[PDB]
């Protein structure tokens, strides 16, 4: 029973690490897409 809980614990730590990696990936992409979109809007904001 102790082991089961220990694996359950090891697995969640592993997961937090993955999400923290993906989370970091997503932030950069979102920051990237924001700049791209900002430029497109600035194009139309001419008239």
């Amino acid at each position: 029973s102790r082991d089961k809980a220990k694996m359950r614990n090891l697995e969640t730590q592993h997961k937090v690490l993955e999400l923290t990696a993906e989370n970091e990936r997503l932030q950069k992409k979102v920051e990237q897409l924001s700049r791209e979109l900002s430029t497109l809007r600035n194009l139309f904001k001419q008239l």
């Binding site: 989370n23 809007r41 194009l43």
Partner: protein, 56 residues
């Protein structure tokens, strides 16, 4: 007794620890889903504008 208490306190602590970890994981999981939304959304927006331009 004094041995049953030590066993209980242990569990109560050990329990609150998994909950915190599971919780941290779950919140990180919700933040990540939110990001995937911003990403898709921004991408749709970007494609819309690009299309608008090409249509001319």
């Amino acid at each position: 007794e004094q041995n049953k208490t030590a066993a209980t306190r242990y569990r109560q602590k050990k329990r609150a620890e998994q909950e915190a970890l599971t919780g941290e994981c779950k919140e990180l999981e919700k933040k990540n889903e939110a990001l995937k939304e911003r990403a898709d959304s921004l991408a749709k927006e970007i494609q819309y504008l690009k299309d608008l331009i090409e249509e001319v």
